[PDB]
Amino acid sequence: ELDQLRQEAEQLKNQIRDARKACADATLSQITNNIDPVGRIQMRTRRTLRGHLAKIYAMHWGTDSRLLVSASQDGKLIIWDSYTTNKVHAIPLRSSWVMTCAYAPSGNYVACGGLDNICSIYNLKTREGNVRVSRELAGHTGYLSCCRFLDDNQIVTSSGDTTCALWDIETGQQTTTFTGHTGDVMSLSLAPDTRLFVSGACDASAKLWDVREGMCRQTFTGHESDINAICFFPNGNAFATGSDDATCRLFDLRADQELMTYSHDNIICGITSVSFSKSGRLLLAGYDDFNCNVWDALKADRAGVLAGHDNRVSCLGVTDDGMAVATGSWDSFLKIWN
Amino acid sequence: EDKAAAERSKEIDKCLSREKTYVKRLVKILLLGADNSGKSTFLKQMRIIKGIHEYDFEIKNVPFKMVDVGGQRSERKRWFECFDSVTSILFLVDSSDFNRLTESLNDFETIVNNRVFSNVSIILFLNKTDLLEEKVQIVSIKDYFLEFEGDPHCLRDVQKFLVECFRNKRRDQQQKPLYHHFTTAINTENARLIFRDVKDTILHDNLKQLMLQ
């Protein structure tokens, strides 16, 4: 009964630990000793985008590398043109408590969500010349923490109730559900080829999910506190986590264990966001000490600092062509670096 | 040339700069309380108008917004506590049911001792005030707290004991004033009390931003 199953679970955990131990024949901290350092990286602000009336909580770059969308605590979305700094759209929401954004790959729709347990989908191309709500998805129990499009027809969301869901937009019903976490889920990230995804959920644990089959495949552990950010390495077989104990880490999906940790003794504050550069050589991280750090992914050293915001950096993103960086903070400004 | 994009952007800025004036007058108050604290009756007797509920009203030409978190408040997570722009927190706590005081105390010392609410003052409404009087004249308050010193059948002693027991839970008392009141079914002066406490909070803030101490 219960005791035999528990014993078998313990035996399998011992097997997993032994299999992970037996594969550690080398490390990046030694193999990467033949890599020339990237040197000192220096960046300057090109544009400053003004107009939000409160804290900024999310952003997402478009797929043409020119338009972007952001959401604020006063309950608004703004769609910006960044080459000229012109505002293209300003969308007012139904409730001021918003926490996430997404921008569709084709450019026809956007989405948002928050403490109302509902995900709203807006249509940007109508014959009447306005923006109207196309769909409202309801059925979650906790608040909404992240949302990412797959195409014009399907979406995937994560909640603060230990669940994730894949939805078909046309009918509005949950096509599949993913369960297994114990605490609230903070963030998820999609694969480049759009077949799998990863999520981190306040257990200091991360899980890898298959979209269509609907089960968890791998589980990674090692942090000491909540995981607040996650993203994929460009070729889709690695990912990086940022947590609330002032530490980032790198995981590989095939070796099933950790490779490097990124942390320095002068940081005593947690992470808010991570992202990679186009070739995978730089890792950008945002902190609660008002600055952003640019790390060398392979040697685990500090290559640069971005400073100029006066409050916490909460949002951070890199374009699809790789020619700019955008940061958003609690002082209600967006900045573009290049 | 197609530079009408710039003119369109200027038109959008003309509306943002209009709403910026209204977003600097509104006063936000976060409402908390127990399950049996008469919360529904308290709010429904003020003549005002599931995720989050919001209520709007006006006192002396000042707009007040009351934000009610209906049972989602049990979350012990920092990211859920994104209510740090509020002017004050308003607790409704019962005192007539002597077996429910420990729960309210444990809720209170859990909320007040949090960091994120260091810049917000706190108001405390001891509720119904009369079933407590009936209990005192029939039963003694020593049967639950073996810490009271005084007359078990005097209402004043009970009131001071409860108020001091609540005030003893907080630390760093001087950060922001803590007010308390006794209300039964008044419903008509509650606006006066909340207005006065918020006004005193703003006055203390001004005495400090102007470098007067």
């Epitope: 020119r66 338009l67 043109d81 012109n86 293209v88 014959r127 009447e128 010349g129 306005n130 | 040339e1 197609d2 009408a4 994009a5 003119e7 369109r8 038109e11």
Partner: single-chain antibody, 232 residues
Framework: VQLVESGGGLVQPGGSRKLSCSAS????????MHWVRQAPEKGLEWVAY????????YYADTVKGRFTISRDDPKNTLFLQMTSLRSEDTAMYYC??????????????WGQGTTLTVSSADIVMTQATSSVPVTPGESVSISCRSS???????????LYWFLQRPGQSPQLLIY???NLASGVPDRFSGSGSGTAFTLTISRLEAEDVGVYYC?????????FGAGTKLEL
């Protein structure tokens, strides 16, 4: 979406007239509006422009000081007040819709127009021909030329192609020299380079005959071409 015009008829030399236009089915206060004109047996000619928020107003060279454009948003109405009429003002007048932001499609809906009868450093655009006999199932091309280069330093080429069928208002085919409009079948194409542009129609079908026009939108005033007719 619908735009309906009123105010036409017969007028004596001198005198005055007022034309009005009523819009229904869209957000009138977010669009800019044009008044365009067509002589009885000639091509199209542009008359006036009013912007959103009533900030900018433009007139043609041969109408300044006599014509006035105005709009009313809480009733969705547009007015053209016109005075001191000559015999050269006899024409059919259309009202046109246009919205400008990054990636939009101007000139994409025309009204039905009204008839009014009365008792240079500009860019020049030239059509190749006045008529081209065609047969169904063929592939045909049209071309037009300009006196300047329409390519700007930001990467856009401002050439527009419209088609007018017998008895109907014009319709947008191509905007900014390469792009298709909504609802236009993908058998139309257009390309070229500075000072030489060509439109290609593949597999001609019925109800695809009429007159074709090319227009520029680089600087005001906006000017039209002479017109190419296809006969089946």
């Amino acid at each position: 979406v619908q735009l309906v015009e009123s105010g036409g008829g017969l007028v004596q030399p001198g005198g005055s007239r007022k034309l009005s236009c009523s819009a229904s089915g869209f957000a009138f206060s977010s669009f800019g509006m044009h008044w365009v004109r067509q002589a009885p047996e000639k091509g199209l000619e542009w008359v006036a422009y009013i912007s959103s928020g009533s900030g900018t107003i433009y007139y043609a060279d041969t109408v300044k000081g006599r014509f006035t454009i105005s709009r009313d948003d809480p009733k969705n109405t547009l007015f053209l007040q016109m005075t001191s009429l000559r015999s050269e003002d006899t024409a059919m007048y259309y009202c046109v819709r246009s919205i400008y932001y990054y990636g939009s499609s101007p000139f994409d809906f025309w009204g039905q127009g009204t008839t009014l009868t009365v008792s240079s450093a500009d860019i020049v655009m030239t059509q190749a021909t006045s008529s081209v006999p065609v047969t169904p199932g063929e592939s045909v091309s049209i071309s037009c030329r300009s006196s300047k280069s329409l390519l700007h330093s930001n990467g856009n080429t401002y050439l527009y192609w419209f088609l007018q069928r017998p008895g109907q208002s014009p319709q947008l085919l191509i905007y900014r020299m390469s792009n298709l409009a909504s609802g236009v079948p993908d058998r139309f194409s257009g390309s070229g380079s500075g000072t030489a542009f060509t439109l290609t129609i593949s597999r001609l079908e019925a109800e695809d005959v009429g007159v074709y026009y090319c227009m520029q939108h680089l600087e005001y005033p906006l000017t039209f071409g002479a017109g190419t007719k296809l006969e089946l």
